[PDB]
């Protein structure tokens, strides 16, 4: 584990060619002294380096702040990084994200898989954790690394194009998000990529409140989706503000992601236990055996696709993991 700190910044060489940079002119300073003319910054933050003037070295990937990026983008960035590494043996990739530090980590993990260092997600995640201790991958990030392994396997999985109808969501038992910690006032969002396509959220006073005896939260949705799906639930809260207005805030109860093309065709239920959910609050706000299920059905006809995914025009079969390293010895050591 080779780490450097200029000041606020933290540069971790996961390998000699893959650098993770943590949370301006100093960025440039460090990298120019060590890798002049041979680095690219893959900025995963939504907020860019427009006024940097070292921006000519920055690829603005603009990934979601909290959620795993769409599989298309995860794959596309890996390929760009690979091409950059191929272009000159002195080239290095510098990965940067906000400090929602899962973004850097999933990119690095995906890169291990893309470059054939590993074929299954566990060993990749283990190498990643050993290189970047302290930053955990959410279950959605791990799930997506699983998707990358499927796509890139010796016999690659071909994601289907059937849309998925999500008939409803059921959450049980009822979790503890109100002030008295005995219930919640929940609403659900469904997104594709970062685009919200449906919400059950309505006026605060219309929102049903749930207590322990309600037993479960059952919300019919009736939405049909294809691709990278995000399903989230929040607790809605109202507070008297200055001016005495109702300040309405929300506290996230959970989030989960999946890609419809990886759901087996005969699936009618998707179930997520607490360990399989992202973005949970403190454990005391959840009942035992907390779980979320989605009642679903895959449709019979392919969806007509606007854009084709980059894995359809790419084969990793020939890719050598030596590309990640600057010598055989570094390579062998890493294993
Ligand atoms: Ca492979
Ligand atoms: Cl409340
Ligand atoms: Cl409530």
For residue 194, report the distance from its CA to the centre of ligand 3, in Å: 28
Contact 154, 232 (CB under 8 A): no
* 97 in catalytic set: yes
User: How would you list the strands of the sheet with 228-240, edge to edge?
Assistant: 195-199, 186-192, 228-240, 246-259
Catalytic pick among 97, 115, 184, 280: 97
Return the residue matching tokens 């999985």: 157
Resolution, Å (one decimal): 2.2
| Domain architecture of the chain: domains with CATH | 1-155+310-335 (3.90.190.10), 164-298 (2.60.40.1110)
CA distance 184 to 22: 36
Which residues does a gap of C–N over 2.5 Å follow in the chain? Answer: 23
Experimental approach: X-ray
Return the residue matching tokens 């071909």: 158
For residue 125, report the distance from its CA to the centre of ligand 3, in Å: 38
For residue 292, report the distance from its CA to the centre of ligand 2, in Å: 21
Contact 115, 331 (CB under 8 A): no
Closest alpha carbon to 207 in 242, 171, 250, 167 = 250
DSSP 8-class letter at 102 = H
DSSP 8-class letter at 289 = T
- Listed in order, strand segments (DSSP E) in 148-307 are 164-172, 183-184, 186-192, 195-199, 210-211, 217-225, 228-240, 246-259, 269-273, 291-298
């Amino acid at each position: 584990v080779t780490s450097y700190t200029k000041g606020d910044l933290d540069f971790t060489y996961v390998t000699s060619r893959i650098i993770v940079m943590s949370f301006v002119d100093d960025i440039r300073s460090f990298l120019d002294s060590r890798h002049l003319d041979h680095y690219t910054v893959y900025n995963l933050s939504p907020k860019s380096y427009r006024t940097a003037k070292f921006h000519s070295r920055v690829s603005e990937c603009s990934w979601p702040i909290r959620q795993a990026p769409s599989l298309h983008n995860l794959f596309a960035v890996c390929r760009n990084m690979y091409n950059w590494l191929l272009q000159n043996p002195k080239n290095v990739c510098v990965v940067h994200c906000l400090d929602g530090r899962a973004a850097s980590s999933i990119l690095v993990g995906a890169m291990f898989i893309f470059c054939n260092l590993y074929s299954t997600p566990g060993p990749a995640v283990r190498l990643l954790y050993a290189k970047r201790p302290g930053i955990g991958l959410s279950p959605s990030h791990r799930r997506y690394l699983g998707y990358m392994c499927d796509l890139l396997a010796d016999k690659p999985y071909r994601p289907h194009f059937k849309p998925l109808t999500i008939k409803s969501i059921t959450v049980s038992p009822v979790p503890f998000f109100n002030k008295q910690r005995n219930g919640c006032r929940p609403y659900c969002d469904v997104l594709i990529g970062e685009t919200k396509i449906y919400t059950t959220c309505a006026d605060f006073e219309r929102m049903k409140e749930y207590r322990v005896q309600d037993g479960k939260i059952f919300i019919p949705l009736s939405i049909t989706v294809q691709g990278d799906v995000v399903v989230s639930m929040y607790h809605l809260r109202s507070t008297i503000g200055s001016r005495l207005q109702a300040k309405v805030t929300n506290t996230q109860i959970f989030q989960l992601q999946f890609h419809t093309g990886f759901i087996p065709l005969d699936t009618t239920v998707l179930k997520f236990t607490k360990p399989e959910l992202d973005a949970c609050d403190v454990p005391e706000k959840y009942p035992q055996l907390f779980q979320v299920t989605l009642d679903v059905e895959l449709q019979p006809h392919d969806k007509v696709m606007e854009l084709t995914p980059p894995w359809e025009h790419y084969c990793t079969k020939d890719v050598n993991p030596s590309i990640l390293f600057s010598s055989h010895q570094e390579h062998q050591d890493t294993l």
